[PDB]
Amino acid sequence: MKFAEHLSAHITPEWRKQYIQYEAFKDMLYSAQDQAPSVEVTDEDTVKRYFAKFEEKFFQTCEKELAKINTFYSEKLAEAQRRFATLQNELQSSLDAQKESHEERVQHRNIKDLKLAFSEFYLSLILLQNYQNLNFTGFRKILKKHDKILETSRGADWRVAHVEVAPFYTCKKINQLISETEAVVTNELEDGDRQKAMKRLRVPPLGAAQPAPAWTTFRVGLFCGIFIVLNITLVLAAVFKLETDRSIWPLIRIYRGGFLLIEFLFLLGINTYGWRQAGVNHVLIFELNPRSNLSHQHLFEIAGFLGILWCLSLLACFFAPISVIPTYVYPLALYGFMVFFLINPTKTFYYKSRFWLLKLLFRVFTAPFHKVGFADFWLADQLNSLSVILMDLEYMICFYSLELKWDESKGLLPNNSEESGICHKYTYGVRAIVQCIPAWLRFIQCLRRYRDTKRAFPHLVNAGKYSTTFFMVTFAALYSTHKERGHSDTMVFFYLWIVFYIISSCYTLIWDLKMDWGLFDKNAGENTFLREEIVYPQKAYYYCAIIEDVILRFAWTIQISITSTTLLPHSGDIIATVFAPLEVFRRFVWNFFRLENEHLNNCGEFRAVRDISV
Amino acid sequence: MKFAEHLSAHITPEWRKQYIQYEAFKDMLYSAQDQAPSVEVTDEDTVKRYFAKFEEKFFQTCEKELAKINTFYSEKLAEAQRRFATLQNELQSSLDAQKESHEERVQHRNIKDLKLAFSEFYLSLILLQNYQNLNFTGFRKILKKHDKILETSRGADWRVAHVEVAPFYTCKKINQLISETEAVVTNELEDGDRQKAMKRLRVPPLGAAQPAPAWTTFRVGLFCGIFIVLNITLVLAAVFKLETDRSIWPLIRIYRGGFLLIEFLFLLGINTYGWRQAGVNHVLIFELNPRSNLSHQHLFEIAGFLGILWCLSLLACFFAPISVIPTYVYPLALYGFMVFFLINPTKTFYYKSRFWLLKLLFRVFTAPFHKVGFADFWLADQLNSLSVILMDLEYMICFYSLELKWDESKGLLPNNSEESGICHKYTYGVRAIVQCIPAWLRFIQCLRRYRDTKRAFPHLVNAGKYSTTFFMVTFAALYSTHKERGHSDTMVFFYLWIVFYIISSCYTLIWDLKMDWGLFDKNAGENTFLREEIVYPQKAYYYCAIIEDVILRFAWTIQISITSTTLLPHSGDIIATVFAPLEVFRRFVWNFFRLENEHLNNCGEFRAVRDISV
Ligand SMILES: O=P(O)(O)O[C@H]1[C@@H](OP(=O)(O)O)[C@H](OP(=O)(O)O)[C@@H](OP(=O)(O)OP(=O)(O)O)[C@H](OP(=O)(O)O)[C@H]1OP(=O)(O)O
Ligand SMILES: O=P(O)(O)O[C@H]1[C@@H](OP(=O)(O)O)[C@H](OP(=O)(O)O)[C@@H](OP(=O)(O)OP(=O)(O)O)[C@H](OP(=O)(O)O)[C@H]1OP(=O)(O)O
Ligand SMILES: O=P(O)(O)O[C@H]1[C@@H](OP(=O)(O)O)[C@H](OP(=O)(O)O)[C@@H](OP(=O)(O)OP(=O)(O)O)[C@H](OP(=O)(O)O)[C@H]1OP(=O)(O)O
Ligand SMILES: O=P(O)(O)O[C@H]1[C@@H](OP(=O)(O)O)[C@H](OP(=O)(O)O)[C@@H](OP(=O)(O)OP(=O)(O)O)[C@H](OP(=O)(O)O)[C@H]1OP(=O)(O)O
Numbered sequence A, B: 001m002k003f004a005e006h007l008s009a010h011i012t013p014e015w016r017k018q019y020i021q022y023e024a025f026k027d028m029l030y031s032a033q034d035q036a037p038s039v040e041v042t043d044e045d046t047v048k049r050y051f052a053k054f055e056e057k058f059f060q061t062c063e064k065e066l067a068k069i070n071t072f073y074s075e076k077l078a079e080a081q082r083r084f085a086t087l088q089n090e091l092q093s094s095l096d097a098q099k100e101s102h103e104e105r106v107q108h109r110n111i112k113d114l115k116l117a118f119s120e121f122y123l124s125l126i127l128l129q130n131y132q133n134l135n136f137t138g139f140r141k142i143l144k145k146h147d148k149i150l151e152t153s154r155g156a157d158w159r160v161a162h163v164e165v166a167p168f169y170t171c172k173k174i175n176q177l178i179s180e181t182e183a184v185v186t187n188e189l190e191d192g193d194r195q196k197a198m199k200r201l202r203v204p205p206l207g208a209a210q211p212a213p214a215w216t217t218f219r220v221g222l223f224c225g226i227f228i229v230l231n232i233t234l235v236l237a238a239v240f241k242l243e244t245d246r247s248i249w250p251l252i253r254i255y256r257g258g259f260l261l262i263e264f265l266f267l268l269g270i271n272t273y274g275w276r277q278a279g280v281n282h283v284l285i286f287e288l289n290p291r292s293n294l295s296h297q298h299l300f301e302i303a304g305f306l307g308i309l310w311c312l313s314l315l316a317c318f319f320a321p322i323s324v325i326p327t328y329v330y331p332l333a334l335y336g337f338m339v340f341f342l343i344n345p346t347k348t349f350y351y352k353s354r355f356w357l358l359k360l361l362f363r364v365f366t367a368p369f370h371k372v373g374f375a376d377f378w379l380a381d382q383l384n385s386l387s388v389i390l391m392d393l394e395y396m397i398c399f400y401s402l403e404l405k406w407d408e409s410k411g412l413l414p415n416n417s418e419e420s421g422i423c424h425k426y427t428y429g430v431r432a433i434v435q436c437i438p439a440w441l442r443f444i445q446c447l448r449r450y451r452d453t454k455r456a457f458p459h460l461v462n463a464g465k466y467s468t469t470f471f472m473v474t475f476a477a478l479y480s481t482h483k484e485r486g487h488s489d490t491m492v493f494f495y496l497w498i499v500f501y502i503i504s505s506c507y508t509l510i511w512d513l514k515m516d517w518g519l520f521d522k523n524a525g526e527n528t529f530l531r532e533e534i535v536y537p538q539k540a541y542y543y544c545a546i547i548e549d550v551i552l553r554f555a556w557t558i559q560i561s562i563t564s565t566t567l568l569p570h571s572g573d574i575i576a577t578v579f580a581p582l583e584v585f586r587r588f589v590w591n592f593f594r595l596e597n598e599h600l601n602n603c604g605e606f607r608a609v610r611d612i613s614v
Helices: A003-009 A013-018 A022-035 A044-099 A102-149 A155-161 A173-189 A194-201 A214-240 A249-278 A282-286 A296-318 A330-342 A351-365 A374-385 A387-403 A433-452 A456-485 A490-516 A539-565 A572-602 B003-009 B013-018 B022-034 B044-099 B102-149 B154-163 B173-189 B194-201 B214-240 B249-278 B282-286 B296-319 B327-342 B351-365 B374-385 B388-403 B430-453 B456-485 B490-516 B539-565 B575-599
Strands: none
Touching (some): A003 A022, A003 A102, A013 A044, A022 A044, A022 A102, A044 A173, A102 A155, A102 A173, A102 A194, A173 A194, A214 A296, A214 B214, A249 A282, A249 A296, A249 A330, A249 A572, A282 A374, A282 A572, A330 A351, A351 A374, A374 A433, A374 A572, A387 A433, A456 A539, A490 A539, A490 A572, B003 B022, B003 B102, B013 B044, B022 B044, B044 B102, B044 B154, B102 B154, B102 B173, B173 B194, B214 B296, B249 B296, B249 B327, B249 B388, B282 B374, B327 B351, B351 B374, B374 B575, B388 B430, B388 B575, B430 B456, B430 B539, B456 B490, B456 B539, B490 B575, B539 B575
């Protein structure tokens, strides 16, 4: 009925330019129909010749499209045949080695990677088959549509004479390859059982708009509604009922991290939805499973549940829920519940994503030794902007270990004490390393990448980009320490520090535009100050992001400076609280164009599957 | 991949017994496969003869199923051809009358009914086409499964030799009929335009019933979450913050009706979901549009919004956030909003259902004159159990017009002695008629039906059933009035009243079982105390409903009698509040089996479309 959006939603992204231009043909046909003058205005010969010339040009365009499709199909078939030959040779070598302990574990890894390579090959073959079917359907539908407006029946004859003889339609090699692959997998690997072998080779409609189950959407809406109502109740309770008898700073300073985490989860769900809709293949970049994947609804549901728990804990800290449990227990219960949810060793509640995240975290935090992929440095980049949660963790540990006297009530709020503040300082040393941890991780990753791929431009400069944070933080700490000690030269520690402000931002900002986002290209074309090809439909997004990155970069250096050095102590807490939720927004904007620039490097290579070895 | 639930969900409910028994064939094949004796000593000849006899019986069953399908298709095709001939003759008569004002309005009505009859005929033809396609697919799939499991080449040969030469597959008369119908509608009726005619004749995937849009489910969940959180907050506020000013009785008596309406909407949504899932075709019975329909999610989304408004109004009444607006304004705003939502004359917010409901309400309340259909008496039956809202309406009108002072913001709470008691007495006697209105409507509908049909068994006994409410209410009112007047003979007005209690319930209860639900049949099989065929899978539902109706009938009788007679001082206002939400539950249970018994009168007639006339 509606072929346009069906074709749009069933297109393989990396081959989007290799399909048929249905919409262009439709617009051309409509323009030709409208351009016809009146019967009386022009003679019948002029109308006849106009129709004839338009038909000729239409058929020339159709011939060009058919030739392009045929060439693409032939190249893909040749590539598939060569890959099959290579895989069969490797499988034969592995099986003859197996026929003739550490050797057993090596073999286990061998048939661990081989059964994945075969699955990837099967996915490629299925994608080629779908491409062929969809292209033929589009040709037939556009010719049928043409054969109605013009009322000249020349499209049916053209289809019968040209498309029906096309090799892209008359060849059966893909089906034979599929059958041989199934036979090889069932015989050599799974040893005679078609059930599990077919189960691991099933291709669900991954290249479509497969809706989520209605229960997931219902849960998302339920959690969102409870969250907004609890938020309104919390705001009213804070405004009306509570009096800040002994400050609420050790309360917001503890509850900031959970709010930041929930906001990050929500924005990540939005990011995933945008990637999926815009046509960016993040599954190939992140090296995920094409058949099993997490949609944005699951992330929204997780964020909603976490927000429900956070709001309930804050409300419990607010009024007087239980008259026997001390009020300094609720944040502990909340964070313990978060940790328990993450590291649950059972097989429930997205058990297939939590383990992947845990292994990724281990690899990230063991940076110098493990090899570096896209996911590792992407997660390290996220942790770079998510350091406020680490700061809150350190502050909460030092507040509970030393400052709060557990024997009274109202443990959390009243910090009424003599030396209240021994934790709101920096002089013992541990306030700068906690903030320099992620920069150190990225610096070490860049060093390892340069060592492996010994090409010193991208990585040594990238490694030097993260080193400016060390200089800035150490100079801020030194200036604050000498100000507290009242040295007459403290002001000089101000001066150079200020330049290490600018040298920081102007560094990273440039790397954000030229290298991370790939803008300001010399082949910009019509798109001014951008690159030649853009995925997202509107340039206003690009211009607004360019505008906002500049502003949000400058108020990242100032937040990390004011917060580690802990200076100007009358508005530092409020400014840090205000500026914390802007860092996540900046990173959320950055992710879009970072992954879009990464994706466009796989569109000139026509790569659609994750190539693997044994 | 999974043909079982596809076949189950794509079956026309009224032709379910005329399809192919796929599950029975699967179970038979599995049992035969499991019953393989043994190679051990049994001997190959015994296994061979067992396989041969099973193959023979399998082929006999397949032949019987094929013959049944062929005969059903032949009968349906003959019926369709005769109906087409009749419709063509009527259309020809109408067009020749049109070719050769009140006559113009009559012609407009004629082409109003004709364009509906043609659409229903087109729906029937499309249903027959789908039946043919699905039956062939099922045959092919089951034969392929048999061939796979029993390692032979008999199934393919049998399919080629028998199913291929079947008329249910080689007869293309339906396609010619469909093309002729399109031609006739496009030429004679829509005058040469295929666009609007085809749009009118399009058959959407009803069987698929594509899982409802995600925004609707999201809104349902959002409204539900807000409702539950507001309910918890309201309960806490009522328990804790309330004040012993003067009574909360003129508040529950006002807010009861909205709660009852919301509960009715929720239970009606559950009812619609149950009807759709169980296979009951309520669209045919209610004479709705087979292409445009309301799902249960829309009713849940209306109910959630109404509950949100109700909870907000109650919270505003409790807290009184605004210090200038009087407290007796909020229920007025709530009920005005409900009325405005119902009678909105624009074209938004389910405008094609509200107008249908309004016309139905007009027909119901003008009962003696209009003809009676299923939708009229069904709605009157619902209003019979929904009289508490009418009682609340009359009480609120009397309370505001007479009692309320409006001068000082004492509001909807209190502060009088006898002003509470003129509205709580029955000197006017108006609270008997407000309760006897729906019984009167049903009684007059039964009288009109008996006059139309001239068959006196069902309708002149139904009218007698409905007439007992008048006796019960009038005797309760007389007893209460004489008790207030202190007559020495008032006790006798008690005595006979008590029998008019029993005579009421034992009447209606019997009509609920034998006639409304069609149970206690004389020719039941293994379903003891039930009817021969049942739609809902489990008999436990039937037995539970049989148990429940008995208790709830006496509860309903005593509740309405006590509420009408205004007797038994304080208890007769908490007992009514407790018993009010049980009469909606009783009606909600009654609807299931009422419509199921109605449905099992077209399944034996093989009627799947609604017949009309011009
Ligand atoms: O005039 P248009 O441009 O609006 O065409 C309409 C419609 O014409 P209409 O006005 O009489 O209803 C066609 O119906 P026909 O009369 O040709 O049969 C319909 O084809 P269809 O029913 O599937 O028939 P088959 O393809 O299965 O053979 C086509 O659907 P697509 O080609 O599949 O996208 C639509 O295209 P669209 O613009 O995308 O909605
Ligand atoms: O070799 P291993 O140690 O990796 O484990 C086997 C397999 O064990 P098995 O031999 O008893 O069938 C695991 O199934 P289980 O024992 O947990 O049921 C399965 O885990 P899984 O499906 O993810 O998890 P679950 O859905 O089953 O809970 C894993 O698949 P991957 O981890 O996805 O690659 C398999 O790898 P492979 O040898 O390539 O088939
Ligand atoms: O052994 P079973 O009883 O489980 O059969 C399975 C499956 O066998 P498997 O174990 O090798 O995967 C069949 O695959 P095959 O090897 O015959 O091709 C499959 O057919 P399929 O792929 O659609 O093939 P085509 O019909 O399109 O030609 C069939 O689907 P349905 O007939 O359409 O319902 C399934 O039936 P089910 O029980 O309902 O899930
Ligand atoms: O004859 P009438 O007075 O009953 O009205 C015509 C038509 O008016 P038209 O002649 O200008 O096209 C109405 O469309 P509008 O004027 O409101 O746009 C349409 O209402 P509708 O589609 O429900 O409502 P909307 O979706 O359009 O808002 C109605 O269809 P039905 O009531 O469903 O039977 C039609 O009946 P028919 O003659 O059989 O085609």
